[PDB]
Amino acid sequence: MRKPSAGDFVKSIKSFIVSFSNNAPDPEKDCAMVQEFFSKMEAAFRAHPLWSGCSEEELDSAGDGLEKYVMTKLFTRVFASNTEEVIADEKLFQKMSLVQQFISPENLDIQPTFQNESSWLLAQKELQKINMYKAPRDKLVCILNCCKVINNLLLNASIASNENAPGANEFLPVLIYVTIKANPPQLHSNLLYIQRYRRESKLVGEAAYFFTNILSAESFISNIDAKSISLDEAEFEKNMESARAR
Amino acid sequence: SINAKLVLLGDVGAGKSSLVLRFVAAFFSQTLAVNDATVKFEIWDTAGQERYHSLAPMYYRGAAAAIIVFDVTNQASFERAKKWVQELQAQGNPNMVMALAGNKSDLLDARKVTAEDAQTYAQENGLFFMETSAKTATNVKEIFYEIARRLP
Numbered sequence A: 001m002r003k004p005s006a007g008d009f010v011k012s013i014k015s016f017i018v019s020f021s022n023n024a025p026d027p028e029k030d031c032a033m034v035q036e037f038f039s040k041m042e043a044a045f046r047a048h049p050l051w052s053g054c055s056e057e058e059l060d061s062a063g064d065g066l067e068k069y070v071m072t073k074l075f076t077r078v079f080a081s082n083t084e085e086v087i088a089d090e091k092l093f094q095k096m097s098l099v100q101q102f103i104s105p106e107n108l109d110i111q112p113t114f115q116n117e118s119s120w121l122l123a124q125k126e127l128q129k130i131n132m133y134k135a136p137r138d139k140l141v142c143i144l145n146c147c148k149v150i151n152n153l154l155l156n157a158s159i160a161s162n163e164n165a166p167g168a169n170e171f172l173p174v175l176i177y178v179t180i181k182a183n184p185p186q187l188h189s190n191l192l193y194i195q196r197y198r199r200e201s202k203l204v205g206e207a208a209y210f211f212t213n214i215l216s217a218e219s220f221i222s223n224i225d226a227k228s229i230s231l232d233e234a235e236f237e238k239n240m241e242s243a244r245a246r
Numbered sequence B: 001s002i003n004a005k006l007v008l009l010g011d012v013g014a015g016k017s018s019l020v021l022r023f024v025a026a027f028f029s030q031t032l033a034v035n036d037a038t039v040k041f042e043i044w045d046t047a048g049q050e051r052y053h054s055l056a057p058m059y060y061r062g063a064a065a066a067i068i069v070f071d072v073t074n075q076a077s078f079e080r081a082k083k084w085v086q087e088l089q090a091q092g093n094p095n096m097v098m099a100l101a102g103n104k105s106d107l108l109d110a111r112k113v114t115a116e117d118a119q120t121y122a123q124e125n126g127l128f129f130m131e132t133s134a135k136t137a138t139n140v141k142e143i144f145y146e147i148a149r150r151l152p
């Protein structure tokens, strides 16, 4: 992009960034505007006489590079950019900082046969990297890495315990456990941001499936009470109070 | 040619994993051929535990097909399967192709759910019932083919 060759792509990107601020911030309108710009620019990368030219992989990378550059410039404006997302982020962090202290695998129907002795620590760590990156793709990669690590550790447990390769029945509760234990900052805003700003042609297939698993994990966790983790009510409140004290 | 999302539904222990594994994990892309046309299935497994029930609409949204699995040796699994059916009809696309899979048919002494009850239920609710066995491979290929046959 630094080439004197592609200067008019650069002017076009720069005048999108400046002209984006002209509008009053609004998530649904902002993301539609970004996706449209992504669609127009990628179409322009492909059709340009000077790029005639490039492999599919090279075009895909250019798409990602553009997604990264634009989203980095727009980050403060579009990420966790309003009161309801700020509130929802904090409610979720607060919920998990309490529940993480006392939740166990059996509360989520994780069978002893699928126990991991690190409590899937590497998956926790992959998830936590989410706020080190600004680009929707790289945030989504943290989620996807978390999911692969979990799936590989579940496979090893089923290998040792001589059972079926793990399905959703095994995977989802473990994702929930892992997410609670990791408690990554601004989880709500991270998932909404990926959903709105990841190049829309790329949030498909297996990526969309594991993304839907973490959205459902977010939904479950937000709604956690005594019943949803099989605890007596009095036992639950007891545990929530001791978590606050600590 | 024809791309279709297929959701798998059923409570734990019914044979949800065994069936997709015999046929081909929580997610698979699977291509089949019927009548000069190609069907590529995207297959979504779902958590079948009751505490996760309210999450399922996220998974069955936009699905073109569903396999609702139960265990013929477990009456409660059949009750659960019926509730999935009612829910998909209340809150799924009317166009969806639904298959009622009656799994572990190989199990003789243990069978608790009759083919009549299952068949009758399916007939009155616009779906088809198919006995399957993951263990012996009976009707595993066929049920997915019968879904792909029926897709609008």
Ligand SMILES: Nc1nc2c(ncn2[C@@H]2O[C@H](COP(=O)(O)OP(=O)(O)O)[C@@H](O)[C@H]2O)c(=O)[nH]1
Pocket: A164, A167, A169, B010, B011, B012, B013, B014, B015, B016, B017, B018, B019, B103, B104, B105, B106, B107, B132, B133, B134, B135, B136
């Ligand atoms: N006899 C018999 N056993 C089966 C069949 N399908 C699955 N199973 C067994 O039932 C148990 C639970 O099945 P599984 O597929 O893991 O259930 P899921 O939790 O719904 O995915 C396992 O021991 C399987 O080997 C079948 O068709 N016949």
